[PDB]
Amino acid sequence: RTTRDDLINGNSASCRDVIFIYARGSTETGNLGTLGPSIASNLESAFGKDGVWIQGVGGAYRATLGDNALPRGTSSAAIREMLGLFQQANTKCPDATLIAGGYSQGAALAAASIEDLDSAIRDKIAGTVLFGYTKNLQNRGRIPNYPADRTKVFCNTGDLVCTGSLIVAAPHLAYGPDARGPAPEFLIEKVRAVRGS
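Structure for cutinase, as requested:
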């Protein structure tokens, strides 16, 4: 359940209405890690298995712990990978609504990619969820160039990465309940806000 490549594998003649692009945390497995599968199962319940495509950021994004210390909180090669997935979604399925998320290094990766993304494409991302956002203090709880109303940050009390450090303490590992409930709830609401139901 930790690898989903629905966008890469998906038929362009049978596009999903909703495409979710997710970046995992440092040292996590597959391309969805620990929190992505819980988000994915809740999105599939809301939109149906053919209504949503789940795509993790794999390829050149190796989720290397040491890359947290680089200027943007991840590597340039990882940013290029996630940018290329947003570009693939826009080309393959131009009428799909996009949603995004990330955890830890993956939250820095999502923020950096969304910042650098061409606005035609960025403006199709109806909502973004960030868990354990390592650039939370530096970016003042925002993704640069992206509206606050479409952003939801989950930053636990005592998660030191949310207050400008790179120390991993116990509250950084405690986002499971958010991934099961509030995070897919937010993403579903932001998709329905623009698409109806």
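Residues 1-197 form a domain with the Rossmann fold fold (CATH 3.40.50.1820).
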